[PDB]
Amino acid sequence: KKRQRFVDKNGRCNVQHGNYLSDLFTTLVDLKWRWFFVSLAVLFLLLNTAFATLYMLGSAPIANQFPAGFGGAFFFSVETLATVGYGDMHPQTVYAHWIATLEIFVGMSSIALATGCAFIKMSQPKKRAETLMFSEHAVISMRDGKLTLMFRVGNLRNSHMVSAQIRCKLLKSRQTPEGEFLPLDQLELDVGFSTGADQLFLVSPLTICHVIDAKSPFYDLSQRSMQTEQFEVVVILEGIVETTGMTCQARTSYTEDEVLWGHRFFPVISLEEGFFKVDYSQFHATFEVPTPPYSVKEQEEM
Amino acid sequence: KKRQRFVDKNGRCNVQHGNYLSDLFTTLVDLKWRWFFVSLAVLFLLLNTAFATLYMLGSAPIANQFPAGFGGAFFFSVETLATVGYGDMHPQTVYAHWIATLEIFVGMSSIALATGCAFIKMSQPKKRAETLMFSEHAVISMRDGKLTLMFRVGNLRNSHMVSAQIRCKLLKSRQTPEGEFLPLDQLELDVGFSTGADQLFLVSPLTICHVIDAKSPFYDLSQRSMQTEQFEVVVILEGIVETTGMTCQARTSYTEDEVLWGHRFFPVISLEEGFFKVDYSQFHATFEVPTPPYSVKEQEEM
Amino acid sequence: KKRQRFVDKNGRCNVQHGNYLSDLFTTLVDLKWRWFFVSLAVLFLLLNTAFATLYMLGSAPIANQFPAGFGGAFFFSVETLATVGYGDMHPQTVYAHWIATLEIFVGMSSIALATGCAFIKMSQPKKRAETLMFSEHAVISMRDGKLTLMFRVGNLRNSHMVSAQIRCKLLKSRQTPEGEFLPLDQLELDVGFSTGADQLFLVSPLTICHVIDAKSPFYDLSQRSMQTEQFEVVVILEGIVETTGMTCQARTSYTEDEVLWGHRFFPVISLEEGFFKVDYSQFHATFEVPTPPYSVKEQEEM
Amino acid sequence: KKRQRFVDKNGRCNVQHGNYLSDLFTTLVDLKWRWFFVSLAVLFLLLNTAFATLYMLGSAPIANQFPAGFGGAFFFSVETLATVGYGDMHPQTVYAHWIATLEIFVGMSSIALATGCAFIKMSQPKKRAETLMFSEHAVISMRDGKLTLMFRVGNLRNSHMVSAQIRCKLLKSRQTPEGEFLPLDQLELDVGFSTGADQLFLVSPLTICHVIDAKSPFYDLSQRSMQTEQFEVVVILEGIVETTGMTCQARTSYTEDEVLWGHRFFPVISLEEGFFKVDYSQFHATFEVPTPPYSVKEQEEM
Ligand SMILES: CCCCCCCCCO[C@@H]1O[C@H](CO)[C@@H](O)[C@H](O)[C@H]1O
Ligand SMILES: CCCCCCCCCO[C@@H]1O[C@H](CO)[C@@H](O)[C@H](O)[C@H]1O
Ligand SMILES: CCCCCCCCCO[C@@H]1O[C@H](CO)[C@@H](O)[C@H](O)[C@H]1O
Ligand SMILES: CCCCCCCCCO[C@@H]1O[C@H](CO)[C@@H](O)[C@H](O)[C@H]1O
Ligand SMILES: [K+]
Numbered sequence A, B, C, D: 001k002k003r004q005r006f007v008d009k010n011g012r013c014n015v016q017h018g019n020y021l022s023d024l025f026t027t028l029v030d031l032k033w034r035w036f037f038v039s040l041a042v043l044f045l046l047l048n049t050a051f052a053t054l055y056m057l058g059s060a061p062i063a064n065q066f067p068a069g070f071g072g073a074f075f076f077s078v079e080t081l082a083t084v085g086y087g088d089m090h091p092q093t094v095y096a097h098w099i100a101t102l103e104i105f106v107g108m109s110s111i112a113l114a115t116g117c118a119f120i121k122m123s124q125p126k127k128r129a130e131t132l133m134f135s136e137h138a139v140i141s142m143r144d145g146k147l148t149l150m151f152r153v154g155n156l157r158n159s160h161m162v163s164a165q166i167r168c169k170l171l172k173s174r175q176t177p178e179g180e181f182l183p184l185d186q187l188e189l190d191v192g193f194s195t196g197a198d199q200l201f202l203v204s205p206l207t208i209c210h211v212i213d214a215k216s217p218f219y220d221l222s223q224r225s226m227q228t229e230q231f232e233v234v235v236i237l238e239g240i241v242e243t244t245g246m247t248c249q250a251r252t253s254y255t256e257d258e259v260l261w262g263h264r265f266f267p268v269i270s271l272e273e274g275f276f277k278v279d280y281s282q283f284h285a286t287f288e289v290p291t292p293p294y295s296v297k298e299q300e301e302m
């Protein structure tokens, strides 16, 4: 179908490199709460099954063991691991006392670790899918007298984020005049770093602008050349979740075929009574407007 | 009465979008401590009422159940959910042991979650209402030879915040020369991003300055045009609470009618004996000063 | 003695403003560990004394109460508040069960809160007094062909901090040409914001430089004028404690009499065998060097 | 062998300065999990051995003490310190009640502290050794018409970091024209601070570039002078671990002998099917390319 992009529209990078709970850690945290707990419950049962078997290795280790056999050892383990200590059943032998001592340490430890995970889980920002949105396409048309590359960004579910900032990079394979091969060269796309305009007040959707001039990597991009050019505009938006103070990031990408020459976005903001309304049905919509086909370079130099 | 502003003086945005505890989470945390705990107490009682009924489904589930009936099941639940485990009352049947096992897991879980919430609650900065203040009005008058837009900001209750930074945006509906409709266009208002002056040393109140020149959105704003202009200056102040390391933000807004042409603020700082005193009675006060009615543009080009 | 400075050498601001545990919170956290715990121990004893009296209001509330009287009620309270629940002593009446239920809730709550405080306490950076140091004096002399204001900063106890940044403000009372009174006006002192040099690699001590040119507030400062000038250079250094990720700040100040014209710092760095040594005995030391008495302005315009 | 560098290739600074758990704190946290817990287990056993001896100072302090003697006092201590409270063994004397009360307080405290440490331990980023890599050498050759200093950086184990930024400093001993001795003077090496290019999108390896021009400290560095020059390029890369929101830093260094004149890096990126592959075998590899031996200064002025 289409060429292989380096970053998916959802922000996922299609890279592959070559030849302490670090990996499974994020997994646990990533899990939805219901599966997070169902997950802890499983470990709980396993640890209890394990210590229960250890107690059974000794003879009459537990006073008033009920029910007799493995079952009682299991429930005693439960009250021990969680430090409940009803005590009707309790260690009756030195061997049982050592097993209980070890289980008590392991139980506190496990509670400590599980508690840490819960906190981090709680501090995590909601998935991008439900917080930040980018327009499917970007466009290029004249704005305030200059050919401009634009795309839209909006913050749905109020994720109470502050310190919102946006950065844009152009990914393109190229060869330098000296003959250096640069497969995924990254060029800066100025979207406000020199005016402070890249520090966003993102409440309602915004149309991000990259002015195409002599310093822009798109200085010589024309309607025609777009048809044979190969590039990828990568967008990075970062913010901090106020409630937690956690820094989050949302990313998207626009390949050459997802940039529409001679288009303009429809507005999404409208003034009502008591408030301004955001019509999300127009979020991705654009329409054609009179735009010259020439690159800024062809125009400054013709 | 007055037009509909996009941001209230208190920082609240009047926006409305279109068609895991995420929402109720902030609510709980937002609550005052007394209601936070009264809130946890309610859940505690409910969980205990719930497990108490479960125990009652079995026959003589609890040894020495006291009082007989639901009451004893309730108190046993209490000592179980909180992992106290006095044990005088304790599971007497396999059924009761399974219910207790489940309750113990739920109790640890609940303690873990409630503990997480408490921490976040503790890390939260005090409300703006009691930490950062903005002058009710902004003014425009000559300072150091240049027409300047000014407003005041101060930090009351020492919220031990560092990394204090301020940003200002001009919100205004406009139409581009190419005919693009921009309902809530955001233009940058330079208040120090090019000198480092936007990185504030906020101890005593400060008068924030926006120099009106050729690059300012207010380049052609005159006393006369102000009377028919429609805009909103949005102010964003961010800082970090030292004690907790949490990043916070305070916002305010100034509509065209809240900007006074030809005014100057009264001073609030005074040198005493041993310290400098801040007279907050003059915080919002301004007085008229000789100021030309022309815009900077009319003056540079007349 | 000397005039009243706005910021003490130790970073303390001498300001006074006018007419939920927020205040006492920092106090507790500020406390040294030994007093933090001795402080929690006191609350523990008080809470236990309180619940002990409540139990005593009922008759024979506790089974096997030992010792008889208040003492037994106190120890039972202890095992209850901390959720130990030995259970030899346990609620014997409905009244005692309600008191115990309330105490159990309060105990979990207290443990939760105390645990939160401990975490924050642990995340706090060590006091400036033992982490960041500033030279007692600043100096002004020629460096690389330009009159420069300099002072020294060093990081003692490796506080594992990253993202170290420095900012400098000139505090001075002045009157604008238009007649505006500005008691504590803050002017920016460029120390690297336009080269990235304000982002410090602070391992060994550094000499911070402010080049005095036409854009500097000190453009017309001469040896003579220094004798009658009144100002205060406020220095703000911020960093993040790597281990905890907490942002901290150290501040100092230099009044006009603490700035030495025609001086240069002695070096503190020396190359040994296997490492570079820092001689802190030379940290504050400076010596006189041939320096013209004229301000940069008198020199550019003479 | 080789001269003494100020920063090792692994980021370690070879500095030595002159004449509350702060030091041992990082140690504990630094420890691998297995040793972290084995470490807590030791304290646990010691505290229990200690309280066990205290109980033994009294006569028949514990009911149903089992086993008789120190052993029973030890196990009772265990159930007390961890707040399990089986209660079969329990305080029988006022003396034992006071010791238990003290142990209970110490146990909660210890659990609180250990829990805090665990959280911080969990929030720590994985060691650089397994997260960020720098090329062994840097090179200098022509790129896009300009003599450029380059080195490579890559992020191995996806440490989910955002807000990635890079800074570069030139460390060199020098003497100012005025005769000031500067042993370890730090000069800024521009690697994108004026284009936003220092804010990296680090997924696949990147070649960092420092353009050598009139403002560069290397303006007069030639192939010949490199042979007798003495300097050290220090590289600082900072990022935030998304999962935890913790800011981390990786550093490296390049002495004059580790900078290869007239070299170029081999590419590491290759386009496969479904993804872009990173060949880490070429990471450190460079080859010679036609490069003039003259410094930029000799060339601009010849
Ligand atoms: C007394 C019981 C208290 C239970 C409290 C449960 C809080 C669960 C919080 O979940 C988190 O909410 C965030 C939004 O706030 C999401 O961004 C995040 O992804 C999600 O994991
Ligand atoms: C042993 C018992 C210890 C109890 C400690 C209770 C600490 C409660 C802290 O509350 C928080 O204080 C912050 C200011 O410090 C406010 O900004 C924040 O809004 C508020 O929620
Ligand atoms: C199993 C018991 C574990 C006990 C752990 C106690 C850790 C105490 C940490 O104190 C903190 O250390 C920081 C430096 O690391 C200081 O900057 C900070 O001011 C100080 O409050
Ligand atoms: C119910 C039991 C749950 C146990 C959870 C154990 C989590 C251990 C996390 O360790 C941390 O992982 C980070 C990467 O995620 C590393 O960067 C860090 O160095 C390492 O210390
Ligand atoms: K118990």
Ligand SMILES: [K+]
Binding pocket: A085, A086, A087, A088, B085, B086, B087, B088, C085, C086, C087, C088, D085, D086, D087, D088
């Ligand atoms: K018990």
Ligand SMILES: [K+]
Binding pocket: none
């Ligand atoms: K606990």
Ligand SMILES: [K+]
Binding pocket: A245, B245, C245, D245
């Ligand atoms: K942070």
Ligand SMILES: [K+]
Binding pocket: none
């Ligand atoms: K944090």
Ligand SMILES: [K+]
Binding pocket: A082, A083, A084, B082, B083, B084, C082, C083, C084, D082, D083, D084
């Ligand atoms: K317990």
Ligand SMILES: [K+]
Binding pocket: A083, A084, A085, B083, B084, B085, C083, C084, C085, D083, D084, D085
């Ligand atoms: K218990």
